[PDB]
Curated annotation (Swiss-Prot):
Protein name per the record: Beta-secretase 1
Keyword Heme found: no
Topological type in the membrane: Single-pass type I membrane protein
Subcellular location: Cell membrane; Golgi apparatus, trans-Golgi network; Endoplasmic reticulum; Endosome
Biological source species: Homo sapiens
Family to which the UniProt record says this protein belongs: Belongs to the peptidase A1 family.
Catalysed transformations (reactions): Broad endopeptidase specificity. Cleaves Glu-Val-Asn-Leu-|-Asp-Ala-Glu-Phe in the Swedish variant of Alzheimer's amyloid precursor protein
GO molecular function ontology, one term from the record: peptidase activity
Role description: Responsible for the proteolytic processing of the amyloid precursor protein (APP). Cleaves at the N-terminus of the A-beta peptide sequence, between residues 671 and 672 of APP, leads to the generation and extracellular release of beta-cleaved soluble APP, and a corresponding cell-associated C-terminal fragment which is later released by gamma-secretase. Cleaves CHL1.
Location of this fragment in the whole protein: 57 to 446 of 501
Lineage: Eukaryota, Metazoa, Chordata, Craniata, Vertebrata
GO biological process: amyloid fibril formation; amyloid precursor protein catabolic process; amyloid-beta formation; amyloid-beta metabolic process; cellular response to amyloid-beta; cellular response to copper ion; cellular response to manganese ion; detection of mechanical stimulus involved in sensory perception of pain
Top enzyme class: hydrolase
Amino acid sequence: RGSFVEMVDNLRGKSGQGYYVEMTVGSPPQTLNILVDTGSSNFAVGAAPHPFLHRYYQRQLSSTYRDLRKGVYVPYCQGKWEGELGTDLVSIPHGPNVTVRANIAAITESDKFFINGSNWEGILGLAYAEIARPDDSLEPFFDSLVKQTHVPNLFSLQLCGAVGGSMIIGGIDHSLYTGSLWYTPIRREWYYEVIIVRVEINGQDLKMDCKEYNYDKSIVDSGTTNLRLPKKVFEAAVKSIKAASSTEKFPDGFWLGEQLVCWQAGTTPWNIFPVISLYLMGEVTNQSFRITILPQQYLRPVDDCYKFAISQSSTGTVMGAVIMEGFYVVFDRARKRIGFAVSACHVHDEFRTAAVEGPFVTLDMEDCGYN
Ligand SMILES: O=C(NCCCS)[C@@H]1CN(Cc2ccc(F)cc2)CCN1
């Protein structure tokens, strides 16, 4: 019921390279840094000596390894990872005090997957069984843990920008947030699908159809760095963000994310940039709430230099790290909902803060969902 002091501050990482938790697999225990991904469902770790890996999973040294003798080929964004399915004992050192037998994909070959210089050697798919590869019978890591232990079906994430954060498996830690929690319901249990009902740029309605905001789907994805928006939605968003930041003019390639914009030390004009507010469907009927991010969230540090961290998506809305770095996100799996509250560690200036406010009266919210 709080406070979960052991789990606090268990996530590490670098800007735009994902957040990883320390895990052990097999016996004797092999320590491996594993990226936290709520956009996938597969637990997959490096098993072959790839150039970018400092270390990997050695199946011959585990006396609790079991081969399933089944191959799997999984595509990611620009590349793909190909591996062999099996099972072993898994634990999280800075997590709950338990050990579980779980399905592990031993990554034997990968094309454009492992990031150079990054400290993680694997991926922890925390989404539901439906999108798990090869199919919906390969039980995802989190589902095993709940079934094999007394750990409640719930986990929360707090990603702090500049990089580190907290993954709390089993409960809600109060030291990690301020104000109140507002819950948007999960529509379907595959990705963590949510419904956006309205979008504002400095309190300026985009006047778009709410179904366009969720075109294909709207998901909360810890794996994804940037904030991703459908082609039509991305167009209007950049237009308004360009409109609000009129005072200074930026090269035309900056808005696509290809270019780098810089200012003198400290003198970063945060006030020139607008705030983005995403209204999400409430639990009550005809009720919603808005979540608000600052430029400190969508301008990613790389003189101080930043890259416009909002990109276009042909796969739907992806509320990635950019959105998540401003809040304390509770994935309340057992109650089919996702909670939002202002992050205690989120980056801000003296004059503006990230916000979560409600309730707001909104009609015809079901129509925002896509089929
Ligand atoms: O998701 C991203 N952006 C969308 C790219 C267009 S498909 C990546 C995330 N990446 C870390 C990572 C890498 C592998 C992974 F399985 C999960 C997360 C850092 C760079 N951006």
